Amino acid sequence: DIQMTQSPSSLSASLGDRVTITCQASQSISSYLAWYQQKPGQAPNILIYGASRLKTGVPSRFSGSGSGTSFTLTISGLEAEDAGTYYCQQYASVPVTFGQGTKVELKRTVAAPSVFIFPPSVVCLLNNFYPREAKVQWQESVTEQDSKDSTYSLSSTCEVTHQGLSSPVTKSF
Amino acid sequence: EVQLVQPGAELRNSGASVKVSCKASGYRFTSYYIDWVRQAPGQGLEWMGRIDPEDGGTKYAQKFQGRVTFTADTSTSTAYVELSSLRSEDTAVYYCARNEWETVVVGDLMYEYEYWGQGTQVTVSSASTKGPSVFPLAPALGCLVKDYFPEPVTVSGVHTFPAVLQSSGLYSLSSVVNVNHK
Amino acid sequence: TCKTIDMELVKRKRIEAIRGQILSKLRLASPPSQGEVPPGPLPEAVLALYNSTRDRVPEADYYAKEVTRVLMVMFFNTSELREAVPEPVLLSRAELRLLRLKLKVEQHVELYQKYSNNSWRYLSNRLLAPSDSPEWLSFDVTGVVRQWNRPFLLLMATPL
Amino acid sequence: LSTCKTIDMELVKRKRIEAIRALYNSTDYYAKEVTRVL
Amino acid sequence: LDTNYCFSSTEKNCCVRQLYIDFRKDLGWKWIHEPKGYHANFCLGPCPYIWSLDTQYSKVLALYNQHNPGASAAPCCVPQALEPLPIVYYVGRKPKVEQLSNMIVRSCKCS
Amino acid sequence: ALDTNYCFSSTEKNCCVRQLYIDFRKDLGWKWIHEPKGYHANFCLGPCPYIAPCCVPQALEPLPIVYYVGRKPKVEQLSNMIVRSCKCS
Amino acid sequence: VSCQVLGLLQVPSVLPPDTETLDLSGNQLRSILASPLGFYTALRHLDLSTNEISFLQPGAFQALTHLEHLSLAHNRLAMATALSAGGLGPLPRVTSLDLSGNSLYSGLLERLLGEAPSLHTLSLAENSLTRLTRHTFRDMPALEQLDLHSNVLMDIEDGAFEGLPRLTHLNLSRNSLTCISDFSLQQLRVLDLSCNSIEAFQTASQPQAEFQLTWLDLRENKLLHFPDLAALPRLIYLNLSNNLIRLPIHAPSEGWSARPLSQLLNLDLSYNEIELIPDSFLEHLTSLCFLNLSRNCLRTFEARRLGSLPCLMLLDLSHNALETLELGARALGSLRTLLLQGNALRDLPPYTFANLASLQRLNLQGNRVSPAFITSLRSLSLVDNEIELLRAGAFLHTPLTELDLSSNPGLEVATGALGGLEASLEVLALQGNGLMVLQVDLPCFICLKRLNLAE
Ligand SMILES: *[C@@H]1O[C@H](CO)[C@@H](O[C@@H]2O[C@H](CO)[C@@H](O[C@@H]3O[C@H](CO)[C@@H](O)[C@H](O)[C@@H]3O)[C@H](O)[C@H]2NC(C)=O)[C@H](O)[C@H]1NC(C)=O
Ligand SMILES: *[C@@H]1O[C@H](CO)[C@@H](O[C@@H]2O[C@H](CO)[C@@H](O[C@@H]3O[C@H](CO)[C@@H](O)[C@H](O)[C@@H]3O)[C@H](O)[C@H]2NC(C)=O)[C@H](O)[C@H]1NC(C)=O
Ligand SMILES: *[C@@H]1O[C@H](CO)[C@@H](O[C@@H]2O[C@H](CO)[C@@H](O[C@@H]3O[C@H](CO)[C@@H](O)[C@H](O)[C@@H]3O)[C@H](O)[C@H]2NC(C)=O)[C@H](O)[C@H]1NC(C)=O
Structure with missing residues (x-):
């Protein structure tokens, strides 16, 4: 049991901006992490392998960094297709544990009901x-x-x- | 390419047992692991254990000790789950993953997942059947739908709202500025 | 087609493959250690069972099966049968074998199972050729067992 | 040093075809006749 | 080694490969009146030899049943089951019906 | 379809079952197989020309053994062990 | 200190702190704990191999700062990767690690191995590695030998050895590889691929620089073609024996199809299915020295090209089915040895062996050849040639030193058959000839040392 936490519960940003989600591990993790990109209706989709090893066919705007205890995901230019929940995972102990999830949405201006x-x-x-x-x-x-x-x-x-x-x-x- | 298919699990009355199917294709079934991850709408993602179809070795997490058992059938390339003694804190979407390399390469360590299933909703409500009673509303305009449990309603500058739970029953809505299968 | 292949390498490769095959069919990661081997010859029961199976009469067929036998109490003690096989999932084969005393005239016999309280269920039938000496006759009774000196019941099942 | 991928299919099948190179309704290496007697 | 999996994918291992023959389209022959064709198929895919040790990890012991089930010296991918095919061909002036043997293959092992 | 009763002690250049002896003490260097001291394994060899082709066994036999695990004796039966006849593929 | 094969259960704590080399091989240690081991920080050669060590403390080896060679070989470390995460820690000064015989596994190996910039030679042979992915061998910039023999390796990605820019010895013997589709290890010097199931071998096309491979070992494989080695100029030794080559690229069992040999020295085409040699095949093997072709079913061997095989010191060709052979004048000029036995020669030109300028040893056993018998030939063997009459001028001007004529029933020796052999012959054997009387004057042979006239 390696409990992990995602620092922002939820965040809202706009197109062409830099988004950051952090991940903190209860104990040392080395470089055995993974980031997921679940859609509002579908199954999770793998984004980052290892701790910074970007997969194939996924946009390169996401970047991985960190090791051991601190990991961050950074999105270069936010797009409408990058709206959803993002997850953490560790594979360094027999119980595989996930994060908590951070919702990413858009915003453009205020509107009156x-x-x-x-x-x-x-x-x-x-x-x-x-x-x-x-x-x-x-x-x-x-x-x-x-x-x-x-x-x-x-x-x-x-x-x-x-x-x-x-x-x-x-x-x- | 390889893809695993799971059918929606509709509804199951409390105290019964559920069966989750993970028919697989596009690859040699008896060569890989199968992981079972559960997404309850209460908290995060939880990892139950994994099975080896070739041998049958079963491992599972600290919480699902004896409350779940998953088997495999190598003749039809399908993997299963058996959840027993259902409670209210069980309604979740049960996914189905694959470790992406091989059983031989992933010997006893743990990896990430690259091939996910589509999930099944094991819902427990103890409600049998009752057709929706659409109610007209007018001074925009819309429709009122009440008690259309237990599986959704499709109704056709539109806005539909997610169904809510109240008095053991669903509640739909519509607004503009019914084809019920069950 | 021309003669250019030697049997030395074929013998050696077959030898090594045989080693690997016995190791794999038994699911032994390493050969068992002989630290706990009791002194003396094999017991009478194990030797008798080995001589019994040596008598001449799906993906999972590759692996070995533990071999056990039960003598008649033809009725049997279900307790001993269940002692042999923990639960009926792992059973892979069960042959009922017989030893006729003497048959100088050809005759036909048929097997049967105690199905109901008084009724019996028919099984496969076979004809016996004449012979002046005792011989072992077999009848595959695998289905009935899973549902469930003197003639005995030989069993073959996956080890626990 | 890398192993092998993309085993060909078109060339193989053409070779195989070269290698392959009421009486009907009721239905050794050398072929055997088919006849019916009632 | 499912037949569907082998016939609807590309792997470098001994699997049965899908093939349908048409007497006119594929064979280019017209003396066989019936039927229009059959699924003969074929076996293709190497079976590697596994050099063994006394001490092996528990999970490499599964490669033997897949690659060298018979502990041979040079394993080969061969058909394991076969089916007959009746045709109707003209030999001269008298039509002939025969039940040819070893024509349709379903599964292939390493032998 | 060439069993041991034909090809043994015969001069044949075509494929048939050949002789071979397994002795666990000397070839495999094992002391944990109590019974038997060995068995006749045999192997198929010989060209199979067109009427690439391979020569594979057709008839095979089991081989029961007795060995020790811990302190309890056991008897187990292996399968597809002795080559009895060969065919052309 | 040498405590090898003592049956010690735990690590001894009575060793002097000044120990530089410790030996414990063959004991019953089941764990390497940090406290007993950290006392001897001066160790440079630690030897724990051939134990039952299953668990490794995370801070176990971190104190031995002056380690130069450790050997945990033939241990039960396969389960350590599951019992312990991290496995080996960083080894700043270790130069030779040998984890062979551990039943280690790919993936488990990816995590067990800790980074070591001073590692000179790693051994993982006799393990259960099935495939090498891109991230298996990482962070060893000073490795120059990697032993992997007797594994079950089947698949190797394109860039598995990408992080090894200084690997020179690569032993992949007795593995389950089937098809090699590429090869671009520029600085590799030795490649051993014997006892594999390789049906096809293809190399990279048009590299930036010439490869450094000088040793290829394809013996006892299942090759059907002579490999294209146009991009391997410095390959010197080449075994292709015990294969299925038919001179005289595709893998039919798979279905895959996608100065070449100037400095090749040792060619071995024995035990193949070769039936004929195209003329262009022997033109490329210039400066090839020792050529073996025995146990091939070749039926005719000729060399008409002038200067072809100019420095061929040996020509092993025995146990073919030859009917005829032709040797060009001044072609095999430097040919010193010729194996020709086991064949079925019947008729030859009178000067078929005369033109060999420096032939010394010639075996022609079991061939039925009747005597013209060379100022340089030294050892001869006409055994089992079914000879009947030996003419007088058999060896008039051939100073032979060794001569065998055994097993020739019905031999009739003419008077003066051994014409000029009195001063040159040293050992002669005529066993099994069944001769009635000797027509050769033995006392005139001063240089004879041993004689065999049995049977
Ligand atoms: C690549 O690795 C193979 C496998 O180890 C090497 O072949 C092996 O070479 C050793 C010698 O270092 C041989 O050991 C010898 O075995 C005999 C018994 O046959 C023993 O009496 C000797 O005392 C010695 O230990 C071993 O048999 C041999 N194995 C095989 C399969 O041939 C090979 O030399 C390596 N190649 C390179 C270029 O390093
Ligand atoms: C290339 O590799 C092959 C191995 O495939 C080497 O062949 C080996 O050659 C030696 C000597 O020529 C053989 O030993 C012989 O054994 C017989 C008994 O059968 C004995 O009477 C002879 O005196 C000789 O010692 C050995 O069996 C053979 N190996 C195989 C597997 O056939 C060859 O030497 C290598 N090429 C070079 C240039 O080294
Ligand atoms: C085909 O012919 C070649 C010769 O061109 C054979 O290779 C020869 O094999 C013998 C046996 O191993 C070698 O003798 C050995 O030499 C080493 C080193 O000097 C010595 O330590 C051993 O005790 C033994 O005397 C010989 O050197 C080697 N020749 C060459 C050029 O490598 C080859 O074996 C033949 N093929 C077959 C299948 O036999």
């Missing part, structure tokens, strides 16, 4: 807002980021406050 209401199980809906910090008071359900404009949505089954609009508008029917 358009709060809607629907009387009947009443539903209050928000649409086309960027920041995933919508706070609504009377089972919320956010969606996944859209591939077109990287925007969020929410459904509550209402008082809405957000960073996009300064005034905490309250609408009722």
